[PDB]
Design a binder for this molecule. Structure first.
Ligand SMILES: O=C(O)/C=C/c1ccc(O)cc1
Ligand SMILES: [Mg+2]
Ligand SMILES: [Mg+2]
Length: 327
């Protein structure tokens, strides 16, 4: 007998790994452990309307109860979150997600006012995907129309010599199939989610212990709806919220990346994965150093301690990466 119904709204199809492997089990756990007093209704593919960038305010303003979105979809809104967009900062989705949740609980209390964070996380390693151009070197990206999540990933694409076109990943299949874009950055599991394997058939990955980029994402509940739940239902949410949920989402993405990458490397799925060796990779890292330098200067101008935020994000990534490897 449902006492409260929580509407969860996001930008991806129901068939996406995070919907199948996280949102469906989350709904099952919340419905079972509340004895039916909490119903969870899942609305994928922007089914309740508006645009992916509107999602954060859809939860905050109580248009819906829970959202899943990219913080970078609102330029300038989450300045401290932006540090997790910087080039070659992240490792796995799981360890980087755990780093982001800890960072947000330490540094982003004002930035996230008005949502109850079920999970502050990242996506798994970002990679390059094109329709025609095989990227074997930095020069190959010159003038390609490419898309990233956020102003700081788009800045890096422009500094690499691409022509970035800002849009949510939910619109990338439209843009690539209609000739608006040549390619997109995203993790491989996002290729699976958006049905892009037979469209972007050219993929480029990097050498070494860091991924090209990631972006901070959030499963956000309206603080007003959480506060409205009875004192015996708030704790059921709490049992399914926090750093463990961030870790789990990343780990789901890492596993879905492995499935997609293995399928292309084996020829089960058409496509080519090009790997750039250490000397070529170093050239992309050198351009990435200019984005980090510029970001720390801009942070200082905005009254943020840029270096301390970057020292904390990088240390938490290395801490949880080391922890994972030790297990
Ligand atoms: O780049 C974006 O706009 C969004 C990226 C994204 C990557 C993996 C997901 O599972 C969901 C969103
Ligand atoms: Mg609210
Ligand atoms: Mg083709």
């Amino acid at each position: 007998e449902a006492e409260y119904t929580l509407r969860l709204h996001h930008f991806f199809p129901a068939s996406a790994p995070v919907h199948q492997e996280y949102f469906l089990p989350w709904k099952e756990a919340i419905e079972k452990e509340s004895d039916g007093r909490l119903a969870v209704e899942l609305y994928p593919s922007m089914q309740l309307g508006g645009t992916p960038p509107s999602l954060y305010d859809q939860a905050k303003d109580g248009q819906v109860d829970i959202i899943w979105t990219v913080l970078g979809y609102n330029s300038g809104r989450f300045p401290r979150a932006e540090v997790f967009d910087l080039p070659f900062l992240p490792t796995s989705g799981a360890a980087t997600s755990q780093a982001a949740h800890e960072y947000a609980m330490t540094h982003m209390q004002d930035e996230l006012e008005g949502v109850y964070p079920i999970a502050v996380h990242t996506h798994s390693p970002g990679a390059l995907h094109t329709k025609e151009t095989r990227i074997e070197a930095l020069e190959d990206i010159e003038g390609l129309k490419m898309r990233g999540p956020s102003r700081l990933v788009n800045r890096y694409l422009a500094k690499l010599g691409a022509e970035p076109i800002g849009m949510p990943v939910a619109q990338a299949l439209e843009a690539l199939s209609r000739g608006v874009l040549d390619g997109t950055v995203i993790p491989f599991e996002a290729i699976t989610a958006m049905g892009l394997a037979d469209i972007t058939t050219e993929h480029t990955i990097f050498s070494g212990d860091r991924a090209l980029y990631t972006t901070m994402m959030i499963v956000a509940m309206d603080q007003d709806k959480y506060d409205a739940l009875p004192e015996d239902l708030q704790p059921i949410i709490d049992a399914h919220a926090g750093g463990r949920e961030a870790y789990r989402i990343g780990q789901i993405m890492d596993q879905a990346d492995h499935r997609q990458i293995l399928a292309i490397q084996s020829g089960e799925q058409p496509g080519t994965i090009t790997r750039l060796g250490s000397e070529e990779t170093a050239r992309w890292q050198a351009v990435g150093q200019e984005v980090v330098d510029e970001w720390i200067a801009e942070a200082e101008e905005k009254g943020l301690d840029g270096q301390m935020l970057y020292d904390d994000a990088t240390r938490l990534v290395e801490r949880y990466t080391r922890a994972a490897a030790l297990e």
